[PDB]
Amino acid sequence: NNHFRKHWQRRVRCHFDQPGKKVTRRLARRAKAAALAPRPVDKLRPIVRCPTVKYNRRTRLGRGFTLEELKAAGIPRLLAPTIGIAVDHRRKNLSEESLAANVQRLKDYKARLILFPRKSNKPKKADTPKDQQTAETTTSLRTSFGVEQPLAPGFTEISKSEIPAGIEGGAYRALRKARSDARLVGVREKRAKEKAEAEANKK
Amino acid sequence: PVERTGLIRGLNKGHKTTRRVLKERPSRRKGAQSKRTQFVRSLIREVAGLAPYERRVIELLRNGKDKRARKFSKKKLGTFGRAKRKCEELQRIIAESRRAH
Amino acid sequence: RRLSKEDASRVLEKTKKRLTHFPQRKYAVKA
Amino acid sequence: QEKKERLLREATAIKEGKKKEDVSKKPYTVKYGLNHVVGLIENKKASLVLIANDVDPIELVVFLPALCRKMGIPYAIIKGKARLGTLVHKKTAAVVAITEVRSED
Amino acid sequence: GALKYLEELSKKKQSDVVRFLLRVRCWEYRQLNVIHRASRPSRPDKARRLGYKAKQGYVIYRVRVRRGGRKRPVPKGATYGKPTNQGVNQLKYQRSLRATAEERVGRRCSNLRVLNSYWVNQDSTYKYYEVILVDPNHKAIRRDPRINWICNPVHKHRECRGLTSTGKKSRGLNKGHRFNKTRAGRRKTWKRHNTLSLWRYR
Amino acid sequence: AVSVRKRA
RNA sequence: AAAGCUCCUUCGACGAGUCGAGUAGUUUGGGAAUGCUGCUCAAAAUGGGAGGUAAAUUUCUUCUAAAGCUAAAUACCGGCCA
RNA sequence: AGGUUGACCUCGGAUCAGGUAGGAGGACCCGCUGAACUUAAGCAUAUCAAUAAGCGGAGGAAAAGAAACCAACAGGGAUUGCCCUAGUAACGGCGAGUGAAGCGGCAACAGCUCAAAUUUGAAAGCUGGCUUCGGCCCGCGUUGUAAUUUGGAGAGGAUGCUUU
């Protein structure tokens, strides 16, 4: 399987700098945290559901909140990236569940948000007052606002009186019937059109 | 939108969720005819006239050889849909000239 | 041959308006 | 110089607490600039259009007689883009137009 | 504006008026020099949409390049290796004649930066282009934030490195599955796919 | 009349 | 003076020898589905591109080319310091 | 004076006023051009290899980059790189061999600017020269420099609060 018929020795990449690169990344993170203090080092991310039939069982963090989500949560799209909320204009909301989850996420963020004034001597109405400016703060939105329930709960208990009756004919029979209908949706429509044409011709 | 069945296979398959309708995105407005744009296009059309292949197609439509005209428009423009649309536009031009005369 | 500091720091007037009315704010998030 | 004097008078009126419309009257000038004149023709505001006969490239004005004919504007082709520039205080004007004039004219 | 009418007229290149103008302009450009300065763009709508502004520091240069393929500079037009089953007459240059025109105009004006270029005319022997150039040392250019990015040293000779529009088209810098081998750099992608990555705890 | 946009 | 939010009858410009087609060379895992270049033809306005088997018909889903800028994570047998 | 006097356009001159380019370095980077030895029993497909050599152009990184994308899902959402996908889909004389991408986890994250609009109740824009540093001139420019708008929208209205 493995072959080396090219000049492989010119492009061998060793990784002796792995601990040094970890040290460099940690130093850069400490510098970024010190520069961004007291803000969190990262932005708030929405909860999105992974595509394809393999990964649609699980949710994860997305790029940014949609314009509909920001408008429903009451945050203007120009103020939102200035208080650590990531914005994504490409994503759309095709169902209300994702929007409801992300709007509730935005409202919890806005409730836990502290906003210092631009000028300390002149606070504004939208600004957090100084007597509530002192509170315990978090520095990682990925940890404080993580995907808390990524999968569905795999185990639930119900009473024996509340058992579903079940699909009539059986679930295997239902799957076979659905597959057969999907394969024969076209020829039945053609036969219906042919029968309608024959009835119109010989009514 | 049609509600999904909740099954893994068949017609309208997929996990059951309530679809919402969205306001139409302005990036999808492309292709819509504007009043100023169609005015400018009509003015430039009457100023510039026709290409020689369009004149040949118009002569073919005037003689009524529609199949030969469609084949000629296909071999000129490259593809069948463009040929059909160009032939329809030249039908519109010839009908306009005939109703003018 | 490098650009001067003023020419490097010149911004458009639309950008000036946006940075005037929506700058980077100082914020914190309660735990 | 005339604009500078008008601006000084308007600044004096603003300082004395009067609008610039109280000290300045509604101007009446010829209209120039190709985009501006084409917009006025499309909005059917221009009363008369004069097009220079020697615009290079000619595509800038080759549609203008047809546009004026469709809009119902009186147009005329005249000799001298430099001659029109002498009107509009420039070296060269491709097209000029009148939308409206004073009552004595 | 008039430039909408100029755009819709420039779309109709087989009309009588456009063919007449192209013919007389081809005659004029063929009796002019191969590379010569144009006092103004002959296609103002195309120049304006490609970035030309009527400001000091914007230069237009007209250029003609010989069209067709390329030939290998081998003795007697023949190769002395394995048979290739094809002649040197049918070898195709991997860049555009537009890109060749931009390179020659940049070499003529090495003090400017090439912004873009556009087709103006052609005949059997030559293709004619007009190239927009920007002066990085002009104060009007340096004070304008919409253009002063070109004064930075990273934009020296974009036409020589494929950073113009025709260079991007020839390098295939587009998103998607049709451009899997070239969207991030062909040789960089090849080196990434051919490198042997060995970790410490493997 | 032909207008590019609604004006004030 | 500029700026944001909310709602709406209406309007809502969006890049052409360019896309695309054929052909040849080259290239690709894309020698039925790849990209690039040269030659010939050469567009349109809910239009156009894509949806890896050719053609037609009817739908659908996704973006919005032919103008442009932009730090970080990435590379480093050259230079300097350790 | 009109056989005169000028205005534009185009093309020139000057050791004119002010600038800029070349060469070096080239480990890494962006392109062009481009082999053969080798491996296929030999050998014109192939392989080596879209490599070596050759040529052009940058920087401390370069390049790419905010979808004419992936997908077909309950949909993701600029670029780059690592792990995985995967020696898989796929391509291939007489077969030696070649060989991705979507998803997923992670490092790092950041978004924007034009052209296509009439400022038209006032080119509001700008290079250069002289300054008494207030400004004044020679000009560029209406074949369009400012403000406004970029599809995520926006233009017009209506409306009442916020902002610098």
PDB file of N, CA and C in Angstrom, chain E residues 10 19 22-23 28 31-32 76 94 119-120 132 134 136 150 166 169 174 184 190 193-194:
ATOM      1  N   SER E  10     -21.838  48.457 -25.777  1.00  0.00           N
ATOM      2  CA  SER E  10     -20.636  47.638 -25.851  1.00  0.00           C
ATOM      3  C   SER E  10     -20.958  46.154 -25.835  1.00  0.00           C
ATOM      4  N   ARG E  19     -19.029  47.912 -35.187  1.00  0.00           N
ATOM      5  CA  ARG E  19     -18.060  47.344 -36.119  1.00  0.00           C
ATOM      6  C   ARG E  19     -17.293  48.432 -36.865  1.00  0.00           C
ATOM      7  N   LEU E  22     -14.819  49.930 -34.340  1.00  0.00           N
ATOM      8  CA  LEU E  22     -13.732  48.988 -34.098  1.00  0.00           C
ATOM      9  C   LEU E  22     -12.777  48.929 -35.281  1.00  0.00           C
ATOM     10  N   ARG E  23     -13.306  49.020 -36.503  1.00  0.00           N
ATOM     11  CA  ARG E  23     -12.458  48.989 -37.691  1.00  0.00           C
ATOM     12  C   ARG E  23     -11.542  50.209 -37.758  1.00  0.00           C
ATOM     13  N   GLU E  28      -6.145  52.830 -36.622  1.00  0.00           N
ATOM     14  CA  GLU E  28      -5.358  53.824 -35.890  1.00  0.00           C
ATOM     15  C   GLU E  28      -4.344  53.172 -34.956  1.00  0.00           C
ATOM     16  N   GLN E  31      -1.395  51.620 -36.810  1.00  0.00           N
ATOM     17  CA  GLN E  31      -0.376  52.581 -37.230  1.00  0.00           C
ATOM     18  C   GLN E  31       0.266  53.347 -36.080  1.00  0.00           C
ATOM     19  N   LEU E  32      -0.234  53.215 -34.858  1.00  0.00           N
ATOM     20  CA  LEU E  32       0.496  53.712 -33.698  1.00  0.00           C
ATOM     21  C   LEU E  32       1.523  52.679 -33.231  1.00  0.00           C
ATOM     22  N   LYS E  76      15.939  24.337 -34.985  1.00  0.00           N
ATOM     23  CA  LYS E  76      15.195  23.835 -36.147  1.00  0.00           C
ATOM     24  C   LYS E  76      13.772  23.400 -35.795  1.00  0.00           C
ATOM     25  N   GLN E  94       0.232  29.095 -21.036  1.00  0.00           N
ATOM     26  CA  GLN E  94      -0.667  28.926 -19.903  1.00  0.00           C
ATOM     27  C   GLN E  94      -1.195  30.240 -19.343  1.00  0.00           C
ATOM     28  N   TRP E 119      -9.958  44.506 -22.835  1.00  0.00           N
ATOM     29  CA  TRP E 119      -9.920  44.333 -24.280  1.00  0.00           C
ATOM     30  C   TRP E 119     -10.580  45.516 -24.971  1.00  0.00           C
ATOM     31  N   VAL E 120      -9.940  46.034 -26.017  1.00  0.00           N
ATOM     32  CA  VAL E 120     -10.543  47.116 -26.783  1.00  0.00           C
ATOM     33  C   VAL E 120     -10.762  46.778 -28.250  1.00  0.00           C
ATOM     34  N   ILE E 132      -4.817  50.026 -17.046  1.00  0.00           N
ATOM     35  CA  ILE E 132      -4.910  51.067 -16.033  1.00  0.00           C
ATOM     36  C   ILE E 132      -3.726  50.908 -15.091  1.00  0.00           C
ATOM     37  N   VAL E 134      -1.559  52.947 -11.706  1.00  0.00           N
ATOM     38  CA  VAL E 134      -1.702  53.885 -10.603  1.00  0.00           C
ATOM     39  C   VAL E 134      -0.309  54.264 -10.123  1.00  0.00           C
ATOM     40  N   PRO E 136       2.027  55.073  -7.273  1.00  0.00           N
ATOM     41  CA  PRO E 136       2.041  54.970  -5.807  1.00  0.00           C
ATOM     42  C   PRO E 136       2.703  56.149  -5.120  1.00  0.00           C
ATOM     43  N   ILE E 150      -2.462  50.165  -2.797  1.00  0.00           N
ATOM     44  CA  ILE E 150      -1.546  49.825  -3.876  1.00  0.00           C
ATOM     45  C   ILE E 150      -0.175  50.451  -3.684  1.00  0.00           C
ATOM     46  N   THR E 166      -6.813  38.737 -14.635  1.00  0.00           N
ATOM     47  CA  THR E 166      -6.460  37.667 -15.562  1.00  0.00           C
ATOM     48  C   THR E 166      -5.518  36.659 -14.911  1.00  0.00           C
ATOM     49  N   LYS E 169      -7.779  34.421 -12.909  1.00  0.00           N
ATOM     50  CA  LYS E 169      -8.483  33.528 -13.826  1.00  0.00           C
ATOM     51  C   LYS E 169      -7.574  32.405 -14.319  1.00  0.00           C
ATOM     52  N   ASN E 174     -10.960  29.901  -7.662  1.00  0.00           N
ATOM     53  CA  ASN E 174     -12.395  29.914  -7.449  1.00  0.00           C
ATOM     54  C   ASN E 174     -12.747  28.830  -6.444  1.00  0.00           C
ATOM     55  N   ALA E 184      -6.216  27.113  -3.573  1.00  0.00           N
ATOM     56  CA  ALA E 184      -5.321  27.661  -2.564  1.00  0.00           C
ATOM     57  C   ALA E 184      -3.883  27.773  -3.049  1.00  0.00           C
ATOM     58  N   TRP E 190       0.044  20.781  -3.843  1.00  0.00           N
ATOM     59  CA  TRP E 190       0.836  19.593  -4.154  1.00  0.00           C
ATOM     60  C   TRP E 190       1.849  19.295  -3.057  1.00  0.00           C
ATOM     61  N   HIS E 193      -0.004  17.887  -0.089  1.00  0.00           N
ATOM     62  CA  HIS E 193      -0.437  16.509  -0.274  1.00  0.00           C
ATOM     63  C   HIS E 193       0.722  15.530  -0.356  1.00  0.00           C
ATOM     64  N   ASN E 194       1.936  16.003  -0.633  1.00  0.00           N
ATOM     65  CA  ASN E 194       3.080  15.116  -0.797  1.00  0.00           C
ATOM     66  C   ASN E 194       4.040  15.148   0.389  1.00  0.00           C
TER      67      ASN E 194
END
